[PDB]
Design an enzyme around this catalytic site. Structure first.
Site, PDB file in Angstrom:
ATOM      1  CG  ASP A 131      -1.831  -1.201   1.201  1.00 51.65           C
ATOM      2  OD1 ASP A 131      -2.419  -1.426   0.141  1.00 51.65           O
ATOM      3  OD2 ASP A 131      -2.068  -1.856   2.229  1.00 51.65           O
ATOM      4  CE  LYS A 133      -2.269   5.234   1.290  1.00 57.44           C
ATOM      5  NZ  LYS A 133      -1.605   4.066   1.932  1.00 57.44           N
ATOM      6  CG  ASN A 136       2.050   4.618   3.473  1.00 59.09           C
ATOM      7  OD1 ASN A 136       1.538   4.725   4.555  1.00 59.09           O
ATOM      8  ND2 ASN A 136       1.494   3.954   2.517  1.00 59.09           N
ATOM      9  CG  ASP A 152       1.261   2.246   7.906  1.00 56.82           C
ATOM     10  OD1 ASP A 152       1.563   2.307   9.121  1.00 56.82           O
ATOM     11  OD2 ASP A 152       0.268   2.852   7.404  1.00 56.82           O
ATOM     12  CB  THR A 171      -5.965   3.704  -1.817  1.00 58.01           C
ATOM     13  OG1 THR A 171      -7.334   3.540  -2.223  1.00 58.01           O
ATOM     14  CG2 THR A 171      -5.951   4.146  -0.383  1.00 58.01           C
TER      15      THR A 171
HETATM   16  C1  LIG Z   1       0.434  11.299  12.224  1.00 55.89           C
HETATM   17  C2  LIG Z   1       1.176  10.699  11.023  1.00 55.89           C
HETATM   18  C3  LIG Z   1       1.888  11.821  10.235  1.00 55.89           C
HETATM   19  C4  LIG Z   1       0.117  10.044  10.102  1.00 55.89           C
HETATM   20  N1  LIG Z   1       2.187   9.686  11.566  1.00 55.89           N
HETATM   21  N2  LIG Z   1       1.995   8.446  11.547  1.00 55.89           N
HETATM   22  C5  LIG Z   1       3.040   7.799  12.107  1.00 55.89           C
HETATM   23  C6  LIG Z   1       3.039   6.452  12.202  1.00 55.89           C
HETATM   24  C7  LIG Z   1       2.525   5.657  11.176  1.00 55.89           C
HETATM   25  C8  LIG Z   1       2.497   4.273  11.299  1.00 55.89           C
HETATM   26  C9  LIG Z   1       2.983   3.688  12.455  1.00 55.89           C
HETATM   27  C10 LIG Z   1       2.983   2.311  12.623  1.00 55.89           C
HETATM   28  C11 LIG Z   1       3.463   1.764  13.802  1.00 55.89           C
HETATM   29  C12 LIG Z   1       3.970   2.566  14.815  1.00 55.89           C
HETATM   30  C13 LIG Z   1       3.973   3.942  14.654  1.00 55.89           C
HETATM   31  C14 LIG Z   1       3.473   4.509  13.476  1.00 55.89           C
HETATM   32  N3  LIG Z   1       3.475   5.847  13.313  1.00 55.89           N
HETATM   33  C15 LIG Z   1       3.936   8.731  12.518  1.00 55.89           C
HETATM   34  C16 LIG Z   1       5.153   8.657  13.136  1.00 55.89           C
HETATM   35  N4  LIG Z   1       5.636   7.469  13.516  1.00 55.89           N
HETATM   36  O1  LIG Z   1       5.820   9.673  13.345  1.00 55.89           O
HETATM   37  C17 LIG Z   1       3.380   9.906  12.174  1.00 55.89           C
HETATM   38  N5  LIG Z   1       3.890  11.131  12.365  1.00 55.89           N
END
Ligand SMILES: CC(C)(C)n1nc(-c2ccc3ccccc3n2)c(C(N)=O)c1N
Length: 464
Positions: A131, A133, A136, A152, A171
């Site tokens: 997934d 994109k 991510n 992810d 997506t």
């Molecule tokens: C609020 C947004 C911008 C969508 N975001 N998302 C993540 C994020 C994204 C996916 C994750 C998967 C497992 C553990 C932590 C995770 N953290 C993440 C991060 N780890 O800094 C972050 N800033």
């Protein structure tokens, strides 16, 4: 068993991603900040069994690459999974890109080399993203030179993606055709990367259309072109890498590892040589338009979703408080307000920000402070409900206005019906449905709406 909230306290919400909310959290002893993705077992079905999820988690925790988000910890209770990772503060790549005034093939190659380097590493460890994109791709920090961190990686294998449009916006553009048909492997990540590169150099998706289904029809056919005027400014080398990444039959598509060795990556990632390096001005402006459109569609759907939630929760909270009100006088004390609000949470479970009883008491206290001026003992349950719920929607209405203003780049105060068609196509609201709605908001309109009118349209489109 280890209990997540024994070790971490929630500080604040960072955002909403695939499979659930991401919360900034802090270790109660060491002070370490972390980003915790909270996956609600009720909203997200598992595809694999427990044994398989625990083995992947155990492996993910041992992998380290500069372009892959680091996973530190994993917890599971009755209602949720908690994935604890490193927090990055640079935001989404494309939101950084659109703030630039200059962007060249050298910038795009630096970007894509990071991505390919992260993908190559993960595929060597037999993990597929599926997934991939722009959302991510996060930037480590707000610094100009910041590394990319892919988030992810591996989750798609174990958790089933939402079928709600608010969760699948943007997506369709990136998914490999073999994923649509069911037989896929790690080469799907090269395809998605290929789509991303096409966008970086032209600012337009190679597979496009008016709604999710038209986009998928284009992806499944596999045909695209380089006839946009702004491709004339792009090296032949870059187009060649693109053709190899976007090759239909996966066994014939270039591998991530080979893509790293491609002439284009080797040529434009040499920090010195600017043999001929113009700025891709049309691309950057197309990307800004693309991104503003995506964000406004997303904000519109979350606005509607928040409005539907607040109808549900308002009525549920009122019925809970009504039943707690043994006097019938309409008043309740603090502990009772806390008790019903926790009873709401016990039922609702869409509120990962309320990770423990400590979170609830403080939200209640923000609202008891908010009841304008305070009499302690006897509180009018009715007004607490209004204020608690207005609080919940804030982020989403405020975000809606912000996204409208950001989409309205000429500060005209309005969006055209052609623009509405594009936004509602991306949001997957049927064409006949939204015009009928407009006709009812403003019986005399002349092909454009202001912010208030747009908002009124959204309310009608969620049954209000
Ligand atoms: C609020 C947004 C911008 C969508 N975001 N998302 C993540 C994020 C994204 C996916 C994750 C998967 C497992 C553990 C932590 C995770 N953290 C993440 C991060 N780890 O800094 C972050 N800033």
């Amino acid at each position: 068993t280890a209990i997540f909230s024994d070790r971490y306290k929630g500080q604040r919400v960072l955002g909403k991603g695939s499979f659930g909310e991401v919360i900034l959290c802090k270790d109660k002893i060491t002070g370490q900040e972390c980003a915790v993705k909270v996956i609600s077992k009720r909203q997200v079905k598992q595809k694999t069994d427990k044994e398989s999820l625990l083995r992947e988690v155990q492996l993910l925790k041992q992998l380290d690459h500069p372009n892959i988000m680091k996973l530190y910890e994993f917890f599971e209770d009755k209602g949720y999974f908690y994935l604890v990772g490193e927090v990055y503060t640079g935001g989404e790549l494309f939101d950084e890109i659109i703030s630039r005034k200059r962007f060249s093939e050298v910038d795009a190659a630096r970007i894509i080399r990071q991505v390919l380097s992260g993908i190559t590493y993960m595929h060597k460890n037999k993990i597929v993203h599926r997934d991939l994109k722009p959302e991510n791709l996060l930037l480590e920090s707000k610094s100009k030179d910041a590394n990319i961190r892919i988030i992810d990686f591996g989750l798609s294998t174990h958790f089933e993606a939402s079928k709600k449009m608010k969760d699948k916006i943007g997506t369709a553009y990136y998914i490999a055709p073999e994923v649509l048909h069911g037989t896929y492997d790690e080469k799907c990540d090269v395809w998605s990367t290929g789509v991303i590169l096409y966008i970086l150099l032209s600012g337009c998706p190679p597979f496009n259309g008016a709604n999710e289904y038209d986009i998928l029809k284009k992806v499944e056919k596999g045909k695209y072109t380089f006839e946009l005027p702004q491709w004339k400014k792009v090296s032949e080398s870059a187009k060649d890498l693109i053709r190899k990444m976007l090759t239909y039959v996966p066994s014939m598509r270039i591998s991530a590892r080979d893509a790293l060795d491609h002439e284009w990556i080797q040529t434009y990632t040499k920090e010195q040589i600017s043999v001929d390096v113009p700025s891709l001005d049309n691309a950057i402006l197309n990307i800004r338009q693309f991104q503003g459109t995506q964000k406004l569609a997303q904000a519109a759907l979350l606005y509607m979703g928040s409005k539907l939630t607040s109808q549900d929760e308002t009525k549920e909270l009122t019925a809970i408080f009504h039943k707690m009100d043994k006097n019938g006088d309409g008043q309740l004390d603090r502990a009772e307000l806390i008790e019903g609000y926790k009873e709401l949470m016990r039922m609702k479970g869409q509120d990962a920000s309320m990770l423990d009883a400590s979170a609830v008491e403080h939200e209640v206290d923000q609202v008891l402070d908010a009841v304008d001026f305070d009499k302690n003992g006897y509180i009018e349950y009715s007004e607490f409900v209004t204020v608690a719920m207005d609080r919940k929607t804030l982020l989403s209405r405020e975000r809606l206005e912000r996204a409208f203003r950001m989409f309205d780049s000429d500060n005209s105060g309005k969006i055209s019906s052609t623009e509405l068609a594009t936004i509602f196509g991306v949001s997957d609201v049927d064409s006949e449905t939204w015009k009928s709605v407009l006709s009812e908001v403003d019986k005399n309109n002349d092909g454009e709406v202001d912010f208030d009118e747009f908002q009124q349209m959204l309310l009608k489109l969620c049954g209000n």
